[PDB]
Structure formats: structure tokens, C-alpha cells
Symmetry: D3
Subunit: 301 residues, 6 copies
């Protein structure tokens, strides 16, 4: 039976082979991305039974997303290609660290996701229901899907895990705050960035007051991160590793935390695991390339 | 002074390095494409003074299209980057020959082209205004621009050259037929393929009565091509070369025919030149990569 | 329910990117191969429900073979990674056509296959059990498994399909002849090439009297192929396409013929389908890369 | 006349182009490896007259090993391809530093090497006879070859240089200790790792007591290294350079030490040279790629 | 109207893809280089109106230099291909940092440049005239061109910017001192390296006495740099970034300083800008690849 | 003892990876070339004991040429690196077939060859001395060396083989004719192409009366070739293979003919062998890459 269920819109990533302006590249690398897609893959590689709910288009790029989700062993009971196109995006990372991203996903098959996008009995028996703030920001339907989804998960006695992921492209801090204001009641585990808390609440403190979920994980760059359970406040191991491709590192972190949770580990081990996946992904090119496999944690253990 | 002026929506092409399904590729080559862009660059390489009218987005792909046109020596007096994104498309050529394309250009800055897009006096003293049937098919504003453009060209004694290029993606054979029947009177040089004639008029014979422009060039696959000028029907040289990447060959063909015209060469030479350009492009990867330079026609001469 | 079940030793292929001696290559491409693996993946792409029975080692190459089969949708109920290593082989295609292969598979986890390797009830309700003459040649345990397998299939009314594939590396024409003469009674569909018939029976005529299975398909290079069913001899379509990487073409051929059979198509269509699959693979690099997807036969239809 | 003679089994290395699990790679880089092979190449590039004794198979990979040994100028009086195959291996280096290695060398032509594998008069006049602990661990014949070899070198008044190289794949710490226990009497220069001394003697101290050769070089990660001559104990320059591909760095270190010795340099210069080669190789991909040439030491001098 | 005019000889750079001796490479990357060429491109990318004076050969490499200068938007009123060849050079960067360069430019079309190489009225209205010490060292004609050029720039009320660039391949410290001794009277902005001052004057102090131009910029490795205006001595921000390809970093630095000057910025902002471009280029492979575009400075601002 | 001795200027070839103008390539492949070098390596691969006489510069490209010759087993007794640089050249093959070359070899260490370049006694006991018409064309010193060389060879009863290879770059058909008329008496085996005969004597008929050497082989494109020996005219096998990289094919042809001669094979076999070598090279990239190994002629036999 499923331990984790994540949902969202998968994307195909087009990245250059090295630093530099995208305008000067003549070759691009292809990867499968998407916040929840990255989390599903990372969990799946760790031995966690995960299911992914979503849609891709009936095109070559959608077929690519599906092969990857299937090769990795994700459950696609409610994942399928459907009329429409698969969204993609282009990334470029500049010499001195100032990167930029371009989207071609507006109106894609996967951006659809409306309430009822799958069968709620799927969630039955599942430990977690992970979502990302990107999804509800895609369209009104998705914003509705999100709420419906976590509500149907609560109704199933399933913990809701949410990764804020404030995408300024999708919506303004106001709408973001709005959704959160409405969604927060049902979140059990909330993943937040210091910059997000600060960009949506003024300071990394106010935010910690407002968004008071049973468990909050505040990621703070290379300065470890703090996990807030039982009013207590555990700090995480900072990392002195330099970023190869920092895209997807936050997704990996979230996945490592969930894996630890799903495996009933103390908050310290959950944090140690979170940035262990986060660091691995940050250390590799691609969105979730670098995510460690079960057998790997075992050996380093 | 300019001899030719083209106009349309530039596109960035993403192409795998060898045959096979796109779902399995991990690398894509980047090329600057677009029917009119391809003609402009080919003419520019042959030494014909050419200007391209159009828009790209204010992103990295748009900047890429601009440096390309600039590097080739295309006049961009009325070409510029504007708010919005640059359209792109993916290509795939299957082992046995069956190909497929995927577009990500809907709502791009380039498909905006509406009447009055450039200063008409730009066309003054110009020999040819070149357009593609792809342009009016992008939208009603582009369909209008098309007509307005040749109207302004005709008003200035500028020969109007039109490459049908029927794209089933954009419109139906009816709307295509509709646009044609309306635009034909302003056309002086019509480039047409057999399939289109049949796909739009039943047979390569009826299409020729209906679409009777002052000079009509009918491409016939490797069976050469026929040039209908002055009740006369010049037959072109058939070529025995295998297509590497046939995509931009028709444009290279028209461009060579135009260069031949702009130079006032006999129909026999325009065809020879047209077939030459088309083959060099067909034998190369990319949309217009492979198009020869004047110095090449000098030597081969 | 499964329609076809294949079984054998998977192999990882290492191939240079262009012709030339292997001693001079600095780069090798990695592909998943294996006669039966190739058939399974081709059928899986055509929508035929197929299961592969076999073992790989508990290494990185074995994990690679497994994700591939999983990504393609091959049932692996009885396929798994086991102690030992995964066999691999290097390939080399010389400029003028003379090729050479090098094997590193002796004692691999995959060449273990012995009688009872899987639960026989797996074959229940299955249309075909596919095997290759390469399998029984790997070892006496594999030679036994082979016979046991088809015995179990026949006992279940499952049609037994066998691709001779005489590998001089593994055994002599005598042992090959010996195995054949013993296995033939349990065979319903025999795929054979002219060279093998001659290399094992003197001439492509004697081999046909001796090896008289209910349905025998004799591949004849580019001279098409003959299908001998019901005293009838259907001749196949000859193809005029140049081999890029001929290696996995025979398997693609059998797979298409099997898909045609599983779909209950006339011998003419099985051959058309078999020749189609074989050509698409021959025109591509890799062992089974190039094999078409059902959606391709839909369109070409 | 020869200054140094090394012997062992050459291997061909298959490495991915970047970090990551071998299972996800589709391209591999080819290199010539083997402990003693790496030492022979490094010495040869420094101007030291070196001979290499060994065998490769009569295959493309063996031809590759020979071209490399010959291109570099090693003496192959007793090196030749012989019936059988050339051994190979696959390496993979994980994002966070946990690498793994897979072998396909068991039963290779080069694993043969039995006593008398060459003509002992070859050693006559030679300063050193370098061997690696990998060789005697390959087979009983090789274990015999080793002892025979250094015995025939002593009998020739040739110093024996041995690099422990404890390969846990070849044999257990017990057998390792055994061989050393028997071999130690004839070793003049022994190269040891701190981890080895610790893994075979409990602590980097006990080992220093037991293995008391006229000269021992204890490599200690990036913490320089200690050279033990005349009861004295010289320490080596630590290095603050990060590992690109640390494979073969120990071989390079050994080669630089021998080059210094062979050139009659004080123990400090021998150590400075040792980690100068070690650092160069560690700084490059491949097994011995990066080994500096004579002219290089000269310039930095 | 032009803000900056630079002149010299463009070169085509052949660099390996990674560290290592050029002798072992089998693939080389192609780039457009040349001290003044690099400066012109960097200025052009920043929005500064720049013109480049020079010559390339009538070969494929010259056509490549011109496309790049044109794509980037440099003014080529006085730049053209002319009978003769385009110079090239090969670079190699060793594992531990000891690189080497090989030239094939002697007698190239661009090495010509004699007094009158262009029309002095071109300089009219221009803020700066940048030159590099490489040019006058190429030939007697060029040495003459330099003096003539800056003299004609002074006569036009144009500030002369000179980057010493002591190339020991072109001339000895004596001839270098000579030219400077004669040229110094007309230099307004002189760019100097600490090693140069030291290699041509004994110590970074004497040099500062002798070469007393209205403004001198002394580059000091990663130790920032000092700008000397009004007897005052401003220091520059040191940088803790490691060199990817340090070739052209000095040109980029010079360009950033000029851009700041051309934009009337205080000496601190000129220095901040100088090493901002310098660092970007040092951070990328190629000669001027990595040079930032206008829009980039804006965003980081 | 040596059977053949070649001599000339080695060259390093830089070639793009696919057809197209050189101005647009960003990557170049590196190959060791040189008419005589190509012959030497081909013979060396076929097992013919061969020595190459020549010089390269003391740079990285020269070291590259040397390791190549050494790796192939070419005797370099009189080959060495000397002050100066190694010549290189760029190549470009256009889509439709029109090719162009660019040289950077003037004044190289290799074009120094003057009379007395090696010890004449080196030629003793040697079957053939092979030279190319390219050599005497490099300079008067090389033109002298050429004559001196064959004079010394003839004085030793060594057969002199000469491949005209008329290079319009080096000299005119008159100077070529002049050198020929003077050298011909010392020639025993003359390799000539039809174009050269016509380009130097009007028609492939006159050239044969004038240039009447003991054995003349006239290459005739794909129309095979004629071998004129003993008033007899053996016609060679025409080949129906498409040129991949035709550049070094003529040398591969001569080399095979020479190997055939050195082995004392009938003219029919020399031609068969010559055509075989030429085709294998024509079908491969590089100057002499593709040339077969003896073990290949063994198997194809």
C-alpha cells in the first residue's frame, strides 16, 4: 500500500551544459522536472512507496516524463498522458551565479488538474499527501484541486505536507498569503524558505507566528535549517558543499524529510536525511538527478 | 538600398543530433528558424541586400535570433525585441523517415504582426517583398498584416513573392483557399508544391488555373520543378541527393530563385540557383544552416 | 493477462559512436541488449502485454537493465537482480563492413537460468513463449531450462516460438543441430536465417525438410523472407534500406511477426510488420533502439 | 640499459564523464589502467628507462593497451598479446564522494603471469623492480610469479619496490598479511597507506613495527606522507588540492618517489616529487592521465 | 557617434575542453580572441558604442571573426577581410596550473596595420582610443601604426588608453621599454600588471615612477588592483573566485574600467566594474566568453 | 631490417565533425596527417617494417606526431623533434561536396628537409624509398633533399616510389613538370592520378609517354586504376563506396600497392590491396584513420 502521494504538473527542463547566457548556447540537456515530480522520484529511489497524480500531453515530451516516472517505480494509477502538450522550460546559469528561467507551460495538459482529478480512495491508507505551492498558483482549477485534495486527505486521516515554493511568476505575495491563509488550517508539515517567510511576512519571525502548522521546516540557505515541532526548535546540519545545479535541491530536501518521517525517525535524523538528499541533488546537474538510492544510505550507514 | 524585404515570425528550433524518437533524446541542438528568417539569411549570404521585419521576445532566445540575423547582415531597421516570449518548436525525424513537429509559439511576441507593423516607406525602391503562407495563418492580425503589407508594396511598385506553405496546424485548406483567392491578385511570384496544390485544389492541375499569378513556381519533390512564366513552362533540374534535414529546403529554394530574379537571370538560371540552394540546405542540419555564400557560387562558377 | 513471455540473459552493449577499430575509440555508448530482451521491449512498445523472465547481477549495469525493462512496461514478475554480475559485450563495426564482438558474460547472474527458474503458472493464458537459440547454448543448465520452459508452455497450450540464432561462440553446429533435433517437436514457430540453414544443414533446402515446424519463417538478408505455413509459402517484402547498426534487427523482425501473430493478422501482414520492425531497428543505433511504438503503426496506417 | 622494471596485469578503464550512478550513464570514457601500468607510464614520461612485463589478450582492448605502452616509450621486450582476453573494469564516482568499482578481468590473458613469465637477465643492470600487491592476489600463479620475480631481482642485485595496494576483492587481510609475511624479507622499498597498515595490523603503528623494510613510505591522505629511512622519519608536503579523479594517484606517487630514487635524490626531494605526480594525476580524469612529462618538471624548476 | 575605438590583430583560439597537455587532445574548441577584440566585444555588450579597426584574412577563420564582431554590434567601418590569412593560436592548460601557448599568426593579414590603416576622422568625437602593447610588437609597421594612431587621436582630443600586455614572444623588455619610453607622452590611461612593472623596471615601484601617465591602473593578481589618479591611489576589491580560463580576464578588466570611465563614474566604481568583467571572463572558457551584457549589470544593480 | 622508408613533412590536421563551412564550426577534431606519414602508418599496420625520416617542432603538436608514429611502430631512427614549430592545416568539406583547405606550415621545422638529412646507410637493404611530389615542392632545400634521397637509394639498389601529388599551392604545373622530367629517371614506381596527368600534360595519354617509369599506376577516380608494368596494362577493381573523408585515400592506395609489392604479389593483387586500403581510408574520418591492420587482411582472407 502507498505511503506517499504527491501531485502537480511535471515539466521538461532544457539546460545548457555549462555556465553562460542561454543566448550563446547551441546544445541543451534534457531533464524531467517539476517540484512534486522531483519529490516522487527521490522518495521512490529511497524505497518509499510513492504515487504521483498528474497529467502530461500526448506528445514526445509527455512520453518521456512517463517513462522516467515508471522506470523509477512511481505509482501512476492516476497519472496519464491526455490531449494537450507537456510543459517545458529553459534554465541558464550565469558565470557569477545570477541565473534565469523561461517557461513554456501555460495551458499544458498537466496544468489542468481540477477537483476530482483522481479517486480519493487512492489516498486511503497513505501516510502523506505532499503538494507544492506552484500547483495552486497555476490556475483557478488547480488552486481548487489543492484544497480539495488535502481536504480529502484529512478526511482520510492523511497528513498534509506542503512546500510553499513561492513562484513570483505564478502569483503575487498577496494571493500567496491568501491561499496559505485558507490552506494553512489543513497543513501538518509545511516547508518554508527564510526568503519566502521574509518576502511574504516581512521577517523570518512574523511568518513563524502566522503559519503555525503542527510542524514547520525552515530552510536557511547553507545555514542548515530549523525544524519546529512541539514548540521545540531543532536546528539542522549546515553544509559546506558548493552548488553545481541548485535547482531541485529544495525538493530533494523535502523528500528526505518525508522519507525520515515516513520511516518514523526523530526530527534530527529527518533533518540529517533532508539535507543529505538536498546536497546530493545540488551536487548534480538536472532537477532530481543525483537523488540517492536506498542502497546508498545503507552503505554510508 | 534594399533589394528584398521579408517578414514573419522567427522561431528557435530544437533538434536531436540523430534520427529517433524525441522521447529518448537527452540532447537537443539549437537553431534559428522561421520560413522568412531562412529566406532572409540565405539572401544575405548570397549578397542580396535584405531586410527582415518582425519581433521576438525580450528573452534569451529572442536575443539569439537577433544576433543571428545581425551576424548574417540582415537589415533589422524594423526588427526588434519586444515584451513577450520568443516561440520555439521541437523537431523529430524517425529512422524510416516519418517525422513530427511540436510547437510552443502560441501568443509569442513574434506572432503579433498586425497592419502598420513597420514604416511602409521602408519598401521604397525595393525589388521584392517576401512572405509565407505561414504568417497570415498565425492569427487574424497577422492575416491582416499580410494583406496590408503587399498592398503597401504594390502601391510602391514592389514585386510580391509568396510561398504558400500550407500549415494544417494553423488553418484549414478552406481558410487557406480563402486567404489565397483574396491575396492572389496582389501576388507576382507564387512558390507552390505539388502536395499543396492537390491538398488545396484536388490536383496539381486545377490549382494552376485557379492560382494563376504572373510567375508561379511549382516544386515537385525530387522531380525538379516547373517555372510558369509567360505562357512558357520551364522545367527544372532534378537532383539525386539524399535529404539529411529537409526542413528548411523549400525556403532555400525560394531564396535562390529570388536571388536569381533580383539579379535578372533567365528562368533556367533561377531554377538552377533555386535547386542549388535547396539541395545545400537539405544536405545540412538546421533550418537554414547549409545555405551557400556568394563566394561559393563564385568558385562553383 | 500476458500475451507473450520471453526469457534469456540480458546484456549491456558498449558501442563506439562511429565505424572504426575499437582499439582507437575513447568513447563508448551504453545500450541494453539481449536477444529476448530486444523482443520483449519491441512487443512492449507495440502494446503487446509481455513478460521477461531472467536475472541480472546486483550491480549498476543490472540496475540499468531493470529500469529499462520497467520503463518500457515489461512485466518483471519473474525478473530480478541476484548475486553475481551482469554480462556485457563490446561491439565494433569496421569501415568496409567487417564487424567483431567481444563478450564479458561468462559466469554472469543471467546465464544461470536452470529448470524451474519461474512459476510455470505464469505461462497460463499466454499466447506465446519466446526463446532464442542463444539461451540453451550458454550452459547445460540453460539448455535444460530451455526444454523445461517450452515443455511447461506446451503443457499449458502456449505456442512456442524459437529464434535459432546460431552462436558459434557458444556451441558447434553439431550441438546446435543436436539441441534443435530434440527441441523441434515442441516448437510451433521457428525463425531461421539462410546462413544458419546452410551453416547447419548444408543448404537452405535440407534445413527446411529436417526442421519442419508448424510455421517456419526464413529470413533471407535483403531478399525479404519466406513464411512457410500450411504447405503455403508466403514471400515477404524486400527492403532497400542501408544498415546503420544491423545487430538487433533479427529480433525486431521476430517481434513484429509475433505482434502480427498475437493480433491474428494474415501471414502477409505479419511479414509486413516483421520487415517494418526489423528495418526501423536496422536504421538505428543500439540493440533495440529504433523499434517503433504502436502510435507509429497507427499513423503510418 | 633499463633503470626500472615493473610487472602486473594491465586493465582497461570504463569511466563516466561526470559524477553519478553508473546505471544512469549512456556514455563511458575509455582509459588504460593497471597499478604497474600506471607506474611504468609515469616513469616513462619523466625520462626514466622503464620496462613493463605482462600480457594482454589478442583483442581490441589489448591492442589499445600496447599502443599506449609503446606510444609512451615503455620497453615491451617481455610484454605481448596472447590468446585470451584483456581485462576491463567500470568505475563510478558518486556526487558526495562514495565511489564504486566493478571488475571483468577474472581469467584474462594478463592474469596468467606464472614464474618464468620473462627472462631474468632482463632485470640485470636494473635499479628497481616494482610490483603491486594486486598481482600476487590475482591467482596462485601470480602469487608465485611475484616471489620468483623479486627473488630473481635480488639475485641480480636489484632493489625491490612494493606497493601494498590491499585489494579486498582479491584477498582477505589474513592472506594479505601472509604474503607480506613471506615477501617482506626481500622488499627494499615498501609503499603503504595508513588505512592499509590499520586494516592489516590494527593501527598505523603496529604495522610500522612488523613491516620493517629498509625504506617504507606511509601515505596519509592529504596529510602529506612519511618516509622511513635510517630509523629517521621524514614527513612530506601535505596538499590542499581537491580530487578530480583520485584513481591512480597512489601509483603516480609511487612513480615519483622511484624517479627521485632512481635519480639519487635526498628523501625530501623524493617525497616532493612523489606527491607532485600524485597530485597531477589526482587532478585529472583517467588512471594515469595527468602524469607529468620530463620537460614539465624542468620548467617548474 | 562612437564612444570608443580599439584596434589590433584578431586571433582565432584553439583550446582543449579540459586541463591537460595539448599533445593528448583529439578535440579543440574554437573561439575568437585578440586583446583589443576582447575589449571591443566587452564594451559592445555593455552598451558602449565601440568601433574596431583591423584586418583578417580572406579565409574561413576571418569570416568567423567578422560574424562575431558584427553579431556583437561592433562598428567595422574600418574592419575588413583582405588577401592573406587569419592568425590563430593554440592554448593548453595543465592540471596544476602551468599553461602554454603556440602561435600561427606570423605574417597574417591582420598583422599588417601600417600608419593610415584607417581614416583619422573616424576618431573624431570619440572618447577613447584603446590599444594593446601586443600590436606595436607585431611588426615595424604596427609599431608605427600605434604611434600614428594615438597621435591622430590626441590631435582629435581623444584620450589614449593603453594596456601594456608585455608579450615576451613579440619583443624583449628593452624594446618594450623603448616603445613605452616613446609612447608614454601620449598615454592618458595606462593598464599595467605588477609582474610587468617588475619585469620591465625591477620593482612595482620604479615602474610607477617612470610610467607616470595621468591615470595608471596597476592590476595585482587576485589582490585587487590600484588606480592612480590625482596623485591619489585608490585600491580595488580583491576577488576570491578561482580561475576557469584566466585568458582574456585582463582585457575584460580594461573594458570594464573604460566602460566606467566612458560613463563618467568615480574611480571606485570604475574599479568595481573592471574586476566585475574580469571575474566574469576568468569564470568562463574562451577569450571573451563570459563578458556580461548591459541588462546584467542592471539586474545585479 | 627495414623494407620501406618514407620521408616528408608531417602535418596535424584539424577537421570539423560534419560537413559545412568552417566559419561556423565551434569544434575541430585533431588528426596526424602528411602524405608520407599516412603511407608509413598504413604499412606499419600491415606489418611492413617501415621507417619515417622527418622533423616536427619542439611543441605539443610535434610531440603528438611523434607518439602517433611510435604507437604505430614506425622506425624513427632518423625522425626527431627540432627547434621550430609543427605545421598544421584546417580542412572543410561542404554539403554538396565542394571542399577547401587552409595551411599554417610555412617555415615549419618539418619543411626544412635538405640533402644529407639522414644517414644514407639507413637505406641499405631496403626494398623501397617512398616520397611524395609534395616534398620537393615545399622549398628548394626540400626539392634538393628529394633528388639526393633517391640518388642515395638508387646507389644502394633501393626501388624509388614516387606519388606525384601535384599541389598547386606549392608550385606551378611547369615547375612540377620540370622537377618530374628531372627526377623521373631515378623513379621505379610512379603513382599518378588522371587529373594530374591532364593538368600537367594535357591528357591522360601524353603524360604516360612522357612519364614512362618502370611501373606506373594511374588512379582513375572510382573507375578503378590501371597498372602499367612490362608493356602490360592491368586494370583495377572499381569500387562503389561513398567517400566519407577522401583526403588520405590516395596515400592509403599507394601504401597498399607497396605492401603488395614488398610481399611480391602479382599486379592484380597489388591493385586489389591498393584499392582495399584506399577504400577503408576513404570510408573513415581522419587522414589515415581507417587504414587496416594485417589481422584484418588475414580474416578477410
Amino acid at each position: 500500500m502507498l505511503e506517499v502521494v504527491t501531485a502537480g504538473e511535471p515539466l521538461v527542463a532544457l539546460v545548457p551544459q555549462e555556465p553562460g547566457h542561454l543566448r550563446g548556447k547551441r546544445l541543451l540537456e534534457v531533464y524531467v522536472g517539476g517540484a512534486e515530480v522531483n519529490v516522487a522520484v527521490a522518495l521512490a529511489r529511497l524505497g518509499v512507496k510513492v504515487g504521483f497524480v498528474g497529467r502530461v500531453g500526448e506528445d514526445e515530451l509527455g512520453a518521456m516524463v512517463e517513462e522516467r516516472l515508471r522506470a523509477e517505480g512511481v505509482d501512476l494509477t492516476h497519472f496519464r498522458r491526455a490531449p494537450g502538450f507537456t510543459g517545458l522550460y529553459l534554465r541558464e546559469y550565469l558565470p557569477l551565479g545570477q541565473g534565469r528561467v523561461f517557461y513554456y507551460r501555460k495551458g499544458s495538459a498537466g496544468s489542468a488538474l481540477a477537483p476530482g482529478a483522481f479517486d480519493p480512495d487512492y489516498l486511503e491508507g497513505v501516510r502523506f499527501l505532499h503538494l507544492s505551492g506552484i500547483t495552486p498558483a497555476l490556475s483557478p482549477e488547480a488552486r481548487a484541486f489543492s484544497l480539495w485534495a488535502m481536504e480529502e486527505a484529512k478526511r482520510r486521516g492523511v497528513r498534509v505536507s506542503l512546500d510553499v515554493n513561492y513562484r513570483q511568476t505564478l502569483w503575487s505575495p498577496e494571493e500567496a498569503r491568501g491561499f496559505l491563509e485558507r490552506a494553512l488550517p489543513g497543513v501538518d508539515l509545511l516547508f518554508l524558505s527564510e526568503e519566502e517567510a521574509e518576502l511574504l511576512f516581512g521577517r523570518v519571525e512574523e511568518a513563524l507566528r502566522a503559519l503555525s502548522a503542527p510542524e514547520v521546516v525552515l530552510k536557511r540557505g547553507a545555514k542548515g535549517a530549523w525544524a519546529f515541532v512541539d514548540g521545540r526548535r531543532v536546528e539542522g546540519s549546515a553544509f559546506a558543499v558548493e552548488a553545481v545545479d541548485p535547482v531541485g535541491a529544495g525538493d530533494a530536501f523535502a523528500a528526505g524529510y518525508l522519507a525520515g518521517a515516513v520511516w518514523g525517525l526523530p526530527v534530527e535524523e529527518r533533518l540529517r536525511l533532508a539535507n543529505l538528499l538536498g546536497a546530493s541533488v545540488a551536487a548534480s546537474r538536472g532537477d532530481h538527478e543525483g537523488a540517492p538510492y536506498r542502497e546508498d544510505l545503507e552503505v554510508l550507514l
